[PDB]
Amino acid sequence: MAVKVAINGFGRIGRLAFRRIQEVEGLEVVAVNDLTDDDMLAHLLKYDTMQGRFTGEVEVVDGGFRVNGKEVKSFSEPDASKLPWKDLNIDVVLECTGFYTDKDKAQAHIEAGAKKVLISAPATGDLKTIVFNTNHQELDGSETVVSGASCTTNSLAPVAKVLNDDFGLVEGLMTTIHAYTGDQNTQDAPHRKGDKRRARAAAENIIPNSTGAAKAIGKVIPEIDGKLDGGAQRVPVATGSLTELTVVLEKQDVTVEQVNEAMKNASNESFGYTEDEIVSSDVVGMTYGSLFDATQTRVMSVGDRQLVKVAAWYDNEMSYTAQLVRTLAYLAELSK
Amino acid sequence: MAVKVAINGFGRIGRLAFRRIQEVEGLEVVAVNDLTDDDMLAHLLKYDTMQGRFTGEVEVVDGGFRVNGKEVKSFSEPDASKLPWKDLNIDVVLECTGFYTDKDKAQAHIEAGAKKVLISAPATGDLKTIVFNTNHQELDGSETVVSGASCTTNSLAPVAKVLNDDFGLVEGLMTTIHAYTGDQNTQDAPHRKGDKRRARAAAENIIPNSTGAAKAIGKVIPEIDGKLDGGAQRVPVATGSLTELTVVLEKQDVTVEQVNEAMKNASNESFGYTEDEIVSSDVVGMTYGSLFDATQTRVMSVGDRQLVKVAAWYDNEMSYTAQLVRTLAYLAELSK
Amino acid sequence: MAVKVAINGFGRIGRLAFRRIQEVEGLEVVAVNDLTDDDMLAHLLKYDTMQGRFTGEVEVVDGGFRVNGKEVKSFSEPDASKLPWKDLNIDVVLECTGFYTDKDKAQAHIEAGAKKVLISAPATGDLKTIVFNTNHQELDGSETVVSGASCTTNSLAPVAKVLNDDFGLVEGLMTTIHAYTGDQNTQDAPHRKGDKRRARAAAENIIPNSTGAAKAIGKVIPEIDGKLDGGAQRVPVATGSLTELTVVLEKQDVTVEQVNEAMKNASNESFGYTEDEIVSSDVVGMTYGSLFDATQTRVMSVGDRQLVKVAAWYDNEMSYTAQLVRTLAYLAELSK
Amino acid sequence: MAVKVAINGFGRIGRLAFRRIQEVEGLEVVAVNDLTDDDMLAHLLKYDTMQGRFTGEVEVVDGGFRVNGKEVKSFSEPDASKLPWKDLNIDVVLECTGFYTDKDKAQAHIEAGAKKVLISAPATGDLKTIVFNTNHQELDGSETVVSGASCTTNSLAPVAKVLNDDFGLVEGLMTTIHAYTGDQNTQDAPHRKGDKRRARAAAENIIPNSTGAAKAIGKVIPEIDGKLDGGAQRVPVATGSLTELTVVLEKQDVTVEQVNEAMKNASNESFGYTEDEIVSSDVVGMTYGSLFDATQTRVMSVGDRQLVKVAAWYDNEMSYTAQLVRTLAYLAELSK
């Protein structure tokens, strides 16, 4: 029998993690918690605007919903500490609500009976922040709370690591041209968090916004802590994003071909490499955490001084989710 | 000195009502209530994605904000019954939160000290529902709570009235191809009201939805109560909407020219008439409650049996708001 | 060996017909003609914004491109009469350029050597217009030029037939809320055809437009010729469309349940039936020609007089394409 | 009497240039040329998706259209060399077709009888490239063909000049997150220029693309020739754009406040300054060629090595047009 997973917050990441977990043996979602009725949950699992119809069968049943014959218990409890995790034998909670993004707060799940908690976002507190295939080996299995970092962090980390390992990273600035997300308002309206830019119509604007991804890349790659920073422009695509990274390197006389070859060599199931002139919708549903795009590599040289820019695609939904589920699996396998 | 208006809910309609009130003498907004800080409020008044920069000067001051030298007191009180309306001499509350859409609930403003309440939506309970220039003369000045109807009701009313007055309305069905609004989710997510369609990405879908507009047109035009019904398709424009009305008329041998001439004759500052082949973005900001579009008139005749279809544009924002503020002005003038 | 297909115009419908043909045994595309280089053709086959990555392998070769090991000859010839159809043994041309939508013009392919021509649109001239599973049996195999009708015609036909067969169709009007297409301008600009509405920014507007679908439904269902008419509102989704049909029926005391059951009974691989509260993106990629949506049925009754409204979803792209390919297959099978 | 202007290509820039010219005394548009009928031209002048209704009156007359009582002659001649510029006394052609972007080609207008040509784009050949208020004083009045550079170049120039003048520009890389434009396809289709990216659905994608803006900034600012490079991401807003510039400076220990103060001091009617948290739709219609946005300034410092990033907004339409008309006015004034 599988590792028993409970998803807290059946949102974009929660539901896609659910879908992704269907295709990973030894992981089962036995429970889902949100703030809504079961008809809504089943409906949002079946139908997904950007990610497509769920392929299996979804049925509403007493106390939850059944997916391909398998019963998922569901709950409507805003306070995680009151969830029946001890009774259900939860091995790991995928904390995907956006409201427990901190070690202390996530501990609610451990009190409620979960053995571990993996947060679908950056989190404050004394915990590890993990981008799979960049630093997942920093896990030893004894962690009770882990962060899977952010989508952007997952797109950035393998890129920054190659730049650092192969060229020496001096410093850099990043912009992610990022799809709009649920914390953005549909029409211009007050924003819960006081952000005057997330306050504006999501799908009608280029919207500058913050992110920690680059500032907190040091949590994932300690040897470059403090060397990156940058922000985001939220733009009107519902999913699919691009990280542009502009860097100063230690190596001199760096060429486009050298940067690209180095990226290619470091490719794996988390870090994709393409030379095709693709655009954002081509990466919707992709399971790479980061797709390095060699067509966008630039090297500006003035005398002995070089700036190097690179760009990596990610589906800020599915790319992140696939990374999150890998980390989940690995976290489980090490714990047993 | 002016009629003293308080806007409850500085939302899309609230803020646009504020802007529209700036250009109507004898009306002042002296107070605004919402659920946010003053920086947000001032910012959302200044900048508006679809409706353009606010032309005057907006400044944050102690206890509110100043618009062109005029002080607006602001509040952060989700329970209307606790607002200082008595102390401020509120003559009318523009109820624009979407949460007091019922005579009894809106009564909280009366208890708080407001003389009158006008609700920016259809509302249940023993009150009048008013589309300016279609039934505003049903007001006598003694009403304490009034509904300004919906945007769709305001687009539909003058059209249905002409159809009825001039041709006899037997029955009809309506569809409004309607811009998305703030009650719709940015990304597929749980919907507060359990509506599986309003739950979906607002700007990425054709989304079928309900409305009362047609079913409750009887509140505005009693002589055609129960003769209309229909729904909405929410589509990805951030504002600007079209109402398509398909009717069976008692008059025989009706022609396109007849329908069109009849609409033109009935035109005023609430009901515009056009023969130009416009599209939705051409009516953004317009102050007609309803723009009859003659180019879309159709008459299908099979023997003696005719179906007649017409279409009317409205800016679900500014068109409704202009109607609302006319009704507010009139309600005030009759009260004195 | 398969029926030998040439696709003229590797556009939206051309490429999707290509994809669809890959999964239908006894049909092969041996030739493609457009107005561009092979790199472009291959690229647009591989990547598709709304329809997803092509699953197989696509490679540019000398004189064309190779798909999963199979060679496709390609051409760049604007005058179809000059195509090497005789030399290539073309059994059927999928005419998908939008520029040969007439029997006489399409004859260019017969002169160039193709045995038959099937047009991806309504076409003038002495030829048959075919919606698969509604009137495809009107084909005997001796036709040299055939039209596959339009996307709208395919969504409307099975619906209209069931209304007529089961209830008696007196008359009706139709609106399709339709995704924007390639003959719509990106930004407001002159339009090649003089259409002041198709001239406007496709993805920023609700745009009223014509269609023949309903006026020429008589070509597909002769027994209701002249009884339907209507138009379109083009809206900003890149694909996925909805047909609303409002009708007068002969049968009295018709209920929603009756209309819905009658539609359900008529369902097949061309005509789907759903009771789920889906939205346009849920039909992207679907292969039904028409998805009847029971949640949108309405019956308006005033005394003895009834209006009945129904709505059917279609992917104006894939739904039409799947229909087109079925008709192509059938046309081939009857010819041999 | 005014400088007699003829607009070649009544497109986005052409029509907006027309509108802008209505509010600049001593400039008249007496003639317009495009590839379409007068009804379309007049319609597209009246109605504008992003830029709003034309305020004055537009009327179709014999041989052109009348704007506020003033006759504009119109033509339908793809070959500029055949235009009746001698007969009409054209002082300056605003070359806005996108098809004459080269000194030699634009010379067709001089042969046709125009005294001068100003091109609404970067242009090859022996001519000056002008960004108003950055290098317009490089004009002496004897030029017959001039380029007004690109929208991006206009947003970047005043920024780059300040960085250079005040800090010493070593090198930099730029990204413009740019609104989609008319040479982008509506749906994925072959692209006239073989660009596999401009080939994609303009409003559904983040689309990487080239620009010369930065590489040819050296035409406008010769003292920094060859020190900048960069590209674009076309995203789904219909207008309004942001230029991010990441730079290495000679001055050490630069702060955010220094960069911002430096930008503020250089502000004028071409180069605006804001500290407001605006978004793209807030700059639609603005007449600054560049709006420097202080909220986005970043300085990354690792020991003694700094990267400085800044961003300036521009309405790629109206910002560019306003700059183009300023350069037109000035070019005329010096010529007389």
Ligand SMILES: NC(=O)c1ccc[n+]([C@@H]2O[C@H](COP(=O)([O-])OP(=O)(O)OC[C@H]3O[C@@H](n4cnc5c(N)ncnc54)[C@H](O)[C@@H]3O)[C@@H](O)[C@H]2O)c1
């Ligand atoms: N959308 C993305 O690109 C993306 C990518 C990576 C990481 N993330 C992170 O994942 C988290 C969620 O993001 P999302 O886009 O899935 O958001 P979402 O809003 O789609 O989903 C959050 C869900 O949590 C539910 N919820 C809220 N409070 C709850 C409570 N206390 N108890 C139970 N359920 C509750 C909501 O009802 C909602 O369904 C955030 O921290 C976010 O930053 C998002």
Ligand SMILES: NC(=O)c1ccc[n+]([C@@H]2O[C@H](COP(=O)([O-])OP(=O)(O)OC[C@H]3O[C@@H](n4cnc5c(N)ncnc54)[C@H](O)[C@@H]3O)[C@@H](O)[C@H]2O)c1
């Ligand atoms: N938007 C339209 O096109 C449209 C048209 C006509 C009528 N309406 C109606 O107007 C009302 C508001 O619409 P909107 O589009 O402006 O929505 P919105 O979300 O912009 O406005 C809601 C505003 O009210 C505030 N609010 C919510 N609860 C509150 C509380 N109890 N106390 C104080 N403030 C509170 C919110 O913070 C927000 O500012 C709804 O009834 C809606 O149906 C909307």
Ligand SMILES: NC(=O)c1ccc[n+]([C@@H]2O[C@H](COP(=O)([O-])OP(=O)(O)OC[C@H]3O[C@@H](n4cnc5c(N)ncnc54)[C@H](O)[C@@H]3O)[C@@H](O)[C@H]2O)c1
């Ligand atoms: N939803 C839809 O877009 C859809 C659905 C049903 C039917 N149709 C019809 O099918 C046809 C094609 O539709 P589409 O959207 O795929 O077209 P499209 O705009 O994508 O382009 C069709 C292709 O024809 C090519 N072509 C090849 N030879 C040509 C020549 N001789 N002249 C002109 N073009 C040539 C063009 O380059 C283009 O790639 C049209 O008749 C259309 O109305 C489209």
Ligand SMILES: NC(=O)c1ccc[n+]([C@@H]2O[C@H](COP(=O)([O-])OP(=O)(O)OC[C@H]3O[C@@H](n4cnc5c(N)ncnc54)[C@H](O)[C@@H]3O)[C@@H](O)[C@H]2O)c1
């Ligand atoms: N943001 C912008 O759209 C923008 C900004 C700066 C510069 N520009 C540049 O200005 C130019 C115009 O751009 P646009 O956006 O207005 O393009 P557009 O397609 O909107 O307008 C081009 C117009 O020229 C017409 N035309 C008239 N005579 C022609 C002929 N002889 N041959 C070919 N076409 C003819 C076309 O019908 C069309 O209306 C291009 O160089 C473009 O790069 C565009």
